[PDB]
């Protein structure tokens, strides 16, 4: 089957990051979207799972996620690989890890386990790696002796604000769950106003790709444990750090196919792991038109650093994904814009790509977290804009840089853009009083190809990861289970840009 969208993205990645192919990004064939029996769209893991249910009393989506995480870990024979934003997995997420590992050990196995979290310089870790390890060992009981733990918290750049933001659970290098969902008790589980989020589950070669990505992070992490300012590390049973757990598990034989889905795994190394891809001949003309509303204090890695692109293929993968749209693009995000300063307000190439689509008559929908969501720098669901106008005005500006006419700009913008704040029911706010918050990092194109992962479209220089799938069948499921419902309710909070009927 043809894969025109993957092909274009692959061209972009091989131009940007040829040396990172097979570690930080990889295209594979023969994957399977991992859905349970009798639930074919079940590979798509939404939380809390309450479309058109303002009460959201049951939260079946959350229960399904935790259930699936537990089952995947229960099935482990050799390796369990977990990454997240700090804190270390707690509440029901930790229960899933403990229960799964206990089952694995009960089934005769001695799993190796890596648990990696990223921490901002201003973030204080309450439960540090040694204490988290001890806590797990306690919960594991007699099984602890059979489980090899590596637990670490990391920060790769203090000045360039870089640390792990990827959200992965990879088992035996053959199943993978990834997406926007942080294993954080207080965002999804113990709360009356749960954040809306999306993960996906797959099996096959692309799971190994995810594993190879975590090996790249742990190679750095293990080496830089020599600097406690950057890395805090704790192991159990006197075990060594395990930089290449996934490669050891992979061995020499190729990953076996589990289905027929083609996938590009793609991530990024942020700042402070690797300065550039030395084999890259990537040579872009980086944007000349600077944001007329803000100036970055920090060096702009998003908009003005060639080297950063070469070790962050995910940035260009998202841009080329959007650029591959021939009919329509849906963007579902926490934010399209970042708080500026210290970060650039937006990714210029992304916005220019979008403007290009609008001008060409390609339908563009952007749904973001309601600006009413003001949280601290670290929290999921918060908004980094005061009004949806900050998105449409920027598109208008870029449209004007493109068409040379503001009337031309208006016809493109007003005729082809849908722009709204996220809603999941007819209710505007939870019974909580608090507004609905969106944590998606999702892009879907032509109901054919889509990204689900941890990489936000708003500027951030973190280590992130995600999958891009090309499958009309799978994208149909995404449309039905997530995108059509999102718009059914969110259109009630749609924006009408300035200069539009």
UniProtKB/Swiss-Prot annotation:
Its EC number is 3.1.4.4. GO terms for biological process: cardiolipin biosynthetic process; lipid catabolic process. Inhibited by mercaptoethanol and dithiothreitol. Keywords: Disulfide bond, Hydrolase, Lipid degradation, Lipid metabolism, Repeat, Secreted, Signal. Residues 276-310 are annotated as: Disordered. GO terms for cellular component: extracellular region. Disulfide bonds: none annotated. It catalyses: a 1,2-diacyl-sn-glycero-3-phosphocholine + H2O = a 1,2-diacyl-sn-glycero-3-phosphate + choline + H(+). May be useful in the production of emulsifiers. PROSITE patterns: PLD. Gene3D superfamilies: Endonuclease Chain A. GO terms for molecular function: phosphatidyltransferase activity; phospholipase D activity. Probably has at least 1 disulfide bond. Pfam families: PLDc_2. Optimum temperature is 60 degrees Celsius in both directions. It is found in: Secreted. Residues 160-187, 434-461 form the PLD phosphodiesterase domain. A reversible phospholipase active on phosphatidylcholine (PC) and phosphatidylethanolamine. Lysophosphatidylcholine and egg sphingomyelin are hydrolyzed about 50 times and 100 times more slowly than PC, respectively. During the transphosphatidylation reaction straight-chain hydroxy compounds, such as triethyleneglycol and triethyleneglycol monomethyl ether, were phosphatidylated in good yield, as were monosaccharides. Disaccharides and sugar alcohol reacted slowly, while N-acetyl-D-galactosamine, D-galactosamine and D-galacturonic acid were not phosphatidylated. Belongs to the phospholipase D family. This is Phospholipase D.
